[PDB]
């Protein structure tokens, strides 16, 4: 089909692909891995250290094996060889991942890791053709607690919720503020997060919601929300919604968050085990009715 | 409920129970559109395979007819044909020689164009979009795809524009500036324009717009259209075979639009 030029690359093209990106700081590397086998054509001399692995090992594992398994199927929706830009218009859309250096499941520790990833094309001959590739431009992350630290006044971030208090979406400053990625939250309930003493209040939340539907966003108590070290962080909110402008009803609704405490453990990312079994008692009781009250046209 | 069963179905649909961690399809409803065989994301289009992963990957799926459910799309056919089909997975568990599995059971129903076999009443013929500032497509409604023939993931990061008519794309600056100019206010009507389906024939859409504006940064978060097509596409199958498959003299108008909707309101 009239396709234009590709511009292939070769595997000594690739050390210098995205030295710009490499050279930001000691934090980044860069990969390319096969959309054919899932397996690393270059990654960069620095990822040894950074994910504290060895050259040998992953010049021979596939990149996925690599990555947290909550986190495979962001890693396989946001690489889609098709939704990717090329390599240089609107172009290149962040994602989050943890990734260990392989280890060997005890000595794994698994950091996260910002990724931007990009098509590309490079070298040998199957049946057709020369090799489709991901080019991936990763870099480690930091709790926002810690050392540069995020300023108080930058501290923000932006969620939306469905009527079921379910989340649709999360912005990308959470990350580094709660240790949450994206798709940990995404289709979990925000009621969960809450501070059981915390999460009646949503009650009146979504009924200001109504009321103010059409109107500015408000504000009402501030919330405790936990962080994924277990301590607790309060969010000073201001919400709004949208409303089908059709059957007037309330879509989704929409939070600015100004996280105005920090928690004792500047490390919102430490590794923690946490019980997650019994607990959507009260959950299901808000839920429902919060959904109940949200039908309600206009 | 934990056993080694069965729920039948009917009339371009059925039930494919395949195993999880695993590979090879457990069970298989007797109906067959088109030859036998014993293999099942072997039968996907190269295009949909991220799809059915991303919608069947265990931790997403919900107990069967518990005491809910969500559609997904793909291809799933000389050599070889396709058709598209609808899916609803669900977690189920089932016995073999082998000491409980995990299993996948999935419910699949073949889908018709709107306007063939058994056509779509046309005052149903509705369908909705959102787009970015950008005008890249972020969300499509199931009931787009007997329309246009296209699966949602076809459409989801493409560009509104493509689509349309040369002749017609240029009402989408106008579109853009009646958007800001009645940002606040209900749906507004504006001309028409033409949408090409995936066959390659094109389709009038009636449309209302609307958006969504970001409360704090006061601009244009997203632009919602609900689309009424009004006149059936020379070729009947939506989904049929497509002939005329390079353009570009997208970009600038993209950019007009980008820029003007900047505008804070």
């Not at 020369?130 to 480690?140: I, M, N, R, S």
């Not at 810690?146 to 923000?156: F, S, T, Y």
């Not at 201001?238 to 059957?247: E, L, T």
Request: glycine share 4%; hydrophobic share 40%.
């Amino acid at each position: 089909g009239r396709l234009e030029d590709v511009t292939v690359y070769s595997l000594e093209d690739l050390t210098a692909l995205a030295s710009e990106h490499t050279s930001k700081n000691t934090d980044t590397f860069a990969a390319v891995f096969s959309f054919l086998s899932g397996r690393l054509v270059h990654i960069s001399e620095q990822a040894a250290l950074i994910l504290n692995s060895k050259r040998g090992f992953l010049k021979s594992v596939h990149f996925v094996d690599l990555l947290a398994p909550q986190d495979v199927r962001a890693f396989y929706a946001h690489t889609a060889p098709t939704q990717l830009p090329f390599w240089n218009c609107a172009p290149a859309k962040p994602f989050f991942c943890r990734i260990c250096g392989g280890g060997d499941r005890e000595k794994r520790h698994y950091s996260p890791f910002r990724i931007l990833p990009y098509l590309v094309h490079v070298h040998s001959s199957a049946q057709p053709e020369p090799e489709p590739c991901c080019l991936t431009l990763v870099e480690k992350i930091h709790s926002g607690y810690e050392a540069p630290r995020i300023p108080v006044d930058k501290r923000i971030f932006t969620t939306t919720h469905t009527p079921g208090c379910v989340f649709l979406e999360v912005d990308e400053r959470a990350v580094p503020l709660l240790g949450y990625l994206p798709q940990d939250l995404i289709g979990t309930s925000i009621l969960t997060y809450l501070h059981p003493e915390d999460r009646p209040l949503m009650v009146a939340i979504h009924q200001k919601v109504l009321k103010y539907a059409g109107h500015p966003p408000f504000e009402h108590s501030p919330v405790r929300f936990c962080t994924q070290n277990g301590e607790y962080v309060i969010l000073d909110s201001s919400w709004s919604s949208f409303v089908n402008p059709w059957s007037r009803k309330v879509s989704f609704i929409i939070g600015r968050h100004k996280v105005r405490t920090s928690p004792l453990n500047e490390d919102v990312f430490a590794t923690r085990i946490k019980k997650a079994a019994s607990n959507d008692k009260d959950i299901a009781e808000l839920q429902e009715q919060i959904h109940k009250l949200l039908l309600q046209p206009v």
